[PDB]
Amino acid sequence: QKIAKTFTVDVSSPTENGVFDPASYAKYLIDHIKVEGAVGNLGNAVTVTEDGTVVTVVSTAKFSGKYLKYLTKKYLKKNQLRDWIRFVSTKTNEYRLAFYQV
Amino acid sequence: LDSYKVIEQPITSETAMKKVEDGNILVFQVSMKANKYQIKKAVKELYEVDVLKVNTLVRPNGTKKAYVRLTADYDALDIANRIGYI
Amino acid sequence: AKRTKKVGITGKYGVRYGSSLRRQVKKLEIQQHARYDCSFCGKKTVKRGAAGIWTCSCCKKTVAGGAYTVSTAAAATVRSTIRRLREMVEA
Amino acid sequence: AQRVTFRRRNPYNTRSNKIKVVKTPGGILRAQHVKKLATRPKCGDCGSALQGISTLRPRQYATVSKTHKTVSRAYGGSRCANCVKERIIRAFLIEEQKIVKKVV
Amino acid sequence: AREITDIKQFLELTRRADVKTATVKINKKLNKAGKPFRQTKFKVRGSSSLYTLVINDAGKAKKLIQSLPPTLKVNRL
RNA sequence: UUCAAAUGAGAACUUUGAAGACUGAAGUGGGGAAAGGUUCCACGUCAACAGCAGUUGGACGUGGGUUAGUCGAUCCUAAGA
RNA sequence: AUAUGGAUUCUUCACGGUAACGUAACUGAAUGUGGAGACGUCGGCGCGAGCCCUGGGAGGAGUUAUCUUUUCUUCUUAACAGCUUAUCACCCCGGAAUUGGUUUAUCCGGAGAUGGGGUCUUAUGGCUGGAAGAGGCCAGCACCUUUGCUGGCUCCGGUGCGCUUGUGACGGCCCGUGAAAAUCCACAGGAAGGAAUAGUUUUCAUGCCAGGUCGUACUGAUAACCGCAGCAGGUCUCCAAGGUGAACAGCCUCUAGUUGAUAGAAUAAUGUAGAUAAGGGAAGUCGGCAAAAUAGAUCCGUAACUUCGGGAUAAGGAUUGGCUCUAAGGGUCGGACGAUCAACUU
Ligand SMILES: [Zn+2]
């Protein structure tokens, strides 16, 4: 009825080069994700966990990979990190923050 | 109409010389009176080959051109080498 | 109810053609569209097509008759006269 | 929002030039010329259509078996199953009336 | 293209003296509920038709590939 | 309609990129019948021609190009000859 | 042209079903008869297909000063083959006033209705093969070769007085009743011959051979045809997206296509096309010529005359934006309601 999907994101290639951090990423996610309305409505429904080598999101309500790509592009443009980082996919519901072809 | 009147010339434009290579198809010029039976016969008898099909078309200049495809047991490159033109 | 005072079927002809001609076509047009009784059926299903030819929906029959009615007075009286001339020649 | 074309040399909208639009396994829309429809065979007296007999074009009756073109009874493929009971009963009664008229 | 359902007919057909080539196709499917199974298709080439047999069990397909006639050409994939 | 570059002896008019507009599915789009007859494509080229120009062109010179048991004719008959 | 299987037969030329009829087959001469080919125009109604509209999800692109679970895009399935599928039509049982069934449209029933049970044509759809191996969309990896490799994903639905088109059953119109032949099939008839040691079957399945001659390029029109010419002129037909709107009107836009028509500098009278105007309101002129005014939709209202059908949108009045709400109008599921879903009219 509420089978929880899992979204894992690799951040390594920018992280290990000083141009990224995962903790602000995870906090941004955990406070801008919407549920049924405005932000700040995550009552044991989604969970964001940072590890430094992977960011994991588990939800039970409405969620998708496109929502996550949307929020990530928002974060990157806010931090001025487009033109260098690009959000991609490797498997179904496994993503990574690769580099534009420098 | 002997088999020396039927088959008149080979066609040697570099667009035709690619069918003999890839498609395995001999392009000939035959007489305006031959038909797809006589063309098959004359080719088979002159070069001892296995014809699979013949297509024809009456060109705007006035003559008639034939597309003679061979079977998988022959080689149009070698046959055109024997005739001389490549 | 009565949507027209007097024109009836001829209401489609509008104002055109003159009054007396419409009054004349009214009788014939009411006659040539009514259903009549099949005699070999008992049912009221007869219906004209191709003037002179009257056809039964059921019963698949076909009769000849008037151009705007199944049987006209003239042929009725002709049949009466033949029916009268039948007995005097039977005996 | 893709537009199609006739596929033969006849550019007019006649009876034999009828198009359907079809979606091919290559992602596109394409015309497809359909053929004319078939009429069911009719009773030889009744005028009605016949059961059992399959509906096709005239020539196509030359490639179908004999069971798709007939039934198992007298006048199996031409008459009506009710326009046959009648022509049985009438024959029987006429021969009977003949016999009685010859007796008297 | 036709399709056969009974296996004896398939084996018989592989020995019609006119068939030369067969093909064994593997299809990764799912059984509509939870599990991915490996459906197998055997396709035998006639001379006016092409016949096909579909098997879901893997062991049965193994036994087919085993007891296929040893004179017929077979295109794996 | 405008900017830059390229080619060229030579560029308002050829080619590419960038911008600005138009036809607006009863089209300035995609196909045919009759008719035309090589106008299709490639290479080269400017004496004349395309009512200014021209390195452009349906022009000029030289070559290439139309593949059917299933699409048409062929077969049938209509008005008629 | 035929061979290999199958079916029929010693009752020589098959069985089942009460019946509509069914089938893998299951002989049929002369003559005769039938069916298809094979047919008008309009109106609304039902169904199907492509397109349009739209929800979830899996990838890619755009915008991000602020906002937007956001905007755009890919998510496809051919001829052909097998199983199955309906309005109509038909059969069996039954015997109907206390009159019933029924269409948007009024027709049907003792010449047997309603009801219960069956048979058929397969337009049209559904599933499987063809067929994912194709095509589409992504990621990584290698390059002075003109030529490549490996991974993935390609899924589940909704709606309708929508547009285009096919088709079914009906209704209306005619002093108008709306092609022929080639060709194919079947029926009646009962000639001839044959079986059981071999026939009959090429209308059951599979197997073999062949399919000749001519057209086939391009345009189809403000440059390819006809006009003396490269002439704002003439000439038959198919497909056809979103908004506003009653609408194939006018106005704007996506897919495709074009940017062709001598140019530069200034801005006199005149001419051509399009506009505004104080007070007056036809005094202008042969003459209200030319212009101006009216205009969609909803409501109140509407005369003389009349061949009673009309006149009539007569004439004369009033309203129309945006935003927040109210009432009315339906389906499908459980035997008074209970739950949920969907549309655009007043
Ligand atoms: Zn009657």
UniProtKB/Swiss-Prot annotation, chain A:
**UniProt-listed GO biological process terms:** cytoplasmic translation
The record's GO molecular-function terms, alphabetically, read:
RNA binding; structural constituent of ribosome
Could you confirm whether the keyword Mitochondrion appears in this record? no
The UniProt keyword set, sorted, is: Cytoplasm, Ribonucleoprotein, Ribosomal protein
Q: Where in the cell is it found?
A: Cytoplasm
Q: Name one GO cellular component term.
A: cytosol
Miscellaneous comment as given in the Swiss-Prot or TrEMBL entry: Present with 60400 molecules/cell in log phase SD medium.
What is this protein's function? Component of the ribosome, a large ribonucleoprotein complex responsible for the synthesis of proteins in the cell. The small ribosomal subunit (SSU) binds messenger RNAs (mRNAs) and translates the encoded message by selecting cognate aminoacyl-transfer RNA (tRNA) molecules. The large subunit (LSU) contains the ribosomal catalytic site termed the peptidyl transferase center (PTC), which catalyzes the formation of peptide bonds, thereby polymerizing the amino acids delivered by tRNAs into a polypeptide chain.
Q: How does it assemble?
A: Component of the large ribosomal subunit (LSU). Mature yeast ribosomes consist of a small (40S) and a large (60S) subunit. The 40S small subunit contains 1 molecule of ribosomal RNA (18S rRNA) and 33 different proteins (encoded by 57 genes). The large 60S subunit contains 3 rRNA molecules (25S, 5.8S and 5S rRNA) and 46 different proteins (encoded by 81 genes).
Q: What's this protein's family per the entry?
A: Belongs to the eukaryotic ribosomal protein eL22 family.
Q: What is this protein called?
A: Large ribosomal subunit protein eL22A
Supply the source organism for this entry: Saccharomyces cerevisiae (strain ATCC 204508 / S288c)
Gene symbol?
RPL22A
From Swiss-Prot, chain C:
Subcellular localization: Cytoplasm
Q: What is its main location?
A: cytoplasm
Q: Which GO terms describe its biological process?
A: cytoplasmic translation
C4-type zinc finger span:
38-59
Q: Which HAMAP family match?
A: Ribosomal_eL43 (MF_00327)
**What's the stated role of this polypeptide?**
Component of the ribosome, a large ribonucleoprotein complex responsible for the synthesis of proteins in the cell. The small ribosomal subunit (SSU) binds messenger RNAs (mRNAs) and translates the encoded message by selecting cognate aminoacyl-transfer RNA (tRNA) molecules. The large subunit (LSU) contains the ribosomal catalytic site termed the peptidyl transferase center (PTC), which catalyzes the formation of peptide bonds, thereby polymerizing the amino acids delivered by tRNAs into a polypeptide chain.
Q: What is this protein called?
A: Large ribosomal subunit protein eL43A
- Species in which this protein is naturally found: Saccharomyces cerevisiae (strain ATCC 204508 / S288c)
User: Encoded by which gene?
Assistant: RPL43A
UniProtKB/Swiss-Prot annotation, chain D:
Q: Which molecular-function annotation in GO is an example for this chain?
A: structural constituent of ribosome
Instruction: Specify where it is mainly localized.
Output: cytoplasm
Instruction: Pull one GO CC term from this UniProt entry.
Output: cytosol
Single Gene Ontology BP annotation: cytoplasmic translation
Do you know which InterPro entries this protein is assigned to? Ribosomal_eL34 (IPR008195), Ribosomal_eL34_C_sf (IPR038562), Ribosomal_eL34_CS (IPR018065)
Q: Which Pfam families does the protein's record reference? A: Ribosomal_L34e
Q: Signal peptide span per the entry?
A: none
Subcellular localization:
Cytoplasm
Keyword line: Cytoplasm, Ribonucleoprotein, Ribosomal protein
Superkingdom of origin organism: Eukaryota
Q: PANTHER family, from UniProt?
A: 60S RIBOSOMAL PROTEIN L34 (PTHR10759)
- What does the record note on quaternary structure? Component of the large ribosomal subunit (LSU). Mature yeast ribosomes consist of a small (40S) and a large (60S) subunit. The 40S small subunit contains 1 molecule of ribosomal RNA (18S rRNA) and 33 different proteins (encoded by 57 genes). The large 60S subunit contains 3 rRNA molecules (25S, 5.8S and 5S rRNA) and 46 different proteins (encoded by 81 genes).
Its function, per the record, reads:
Component of the ribosome, a large ribonucleoprotein complex responsible for the synthesis of proteins in the cell. The small ribosomal subunit (SSU) binds messenger RNAs (mRNAs) and translates the encoded message by selecting cognate aminoacyl-transfer RNA (tRNA) molecules. The large subunit (LSU) contains the ribosomal catalytic site termed the peptidyl transferase center (PTC), which catalyzes the formation of peptide bonds, thereby polymerizing the amino acids delivered by tRNAs into a polypeptide chain.
Hey, which family's this protein in? Belongs to the eukaryotic ribosomal protein eL34 family.
| Name of encoding gene | RPL34A
Curated annotation (Swiss-Prot), chain E:
According to its UniProt record, where is this protein mainly located?
cytoplasm
Question: Keywords in UniProt for this one?
Answer: Cytoplasm, Ribonucleoprotein, Ribosomal protein
Q: Where in the cell is it found?
A: Cytoplasm
| Molecular functions per Gene Ontology | structural constituent of ribosome
List, alphabetically, the GO terms of the cellular component aspect. Answer: cytoplasm; cytosol; cytosolic large ribosomal subunit
Q: GO biological process annotations for this chain's record?
A: cytoplasmic translation; protein-RNA complex assembly
Q: Which family does it belong to?
A: Belongs to the eukaryotic ribosomal protein eL38 family.
- Additional note from the record: Present with 50200 molecules/cell in log phase SD medium.
Tell me, what does this protein do in biology? Component of the ribosome, a large ribonucleoprotein complex responsible for the synthesis of proteins in the cell. The small ribosomal subunit (SSU) binds messenger RNAs (mRNAs) and translates the encoded message by selecting cognate aminoacyl-transfer RNA (tRNA) molecules. The large subunit (LSU) contains the ribosomal catalytic site termed the peptidyl transferase center (PTC), which catalyzes the formation of peptide bonds, thereby polymerizing the amino acids delivered by tRNAs into a polypeptide chain.
What is known about its subunit structure? Component of the large ribosomal subunit (LSU). Mature yeast ribosomes consist of a small (40S) and a large (60S) subunit. The 40S small subunit contains 1 molecule of ribosomal RNA (18S rRNA) and 33 different proteins (encoded by 57 genes). The large 60S subunit contains 3 rRNA molecules (25S, 5.8S and 5S rRNA) and 46 different proteins (encoded by 81 genes).
- What is the name of this protein? Large ribosomal subunit protein eL38
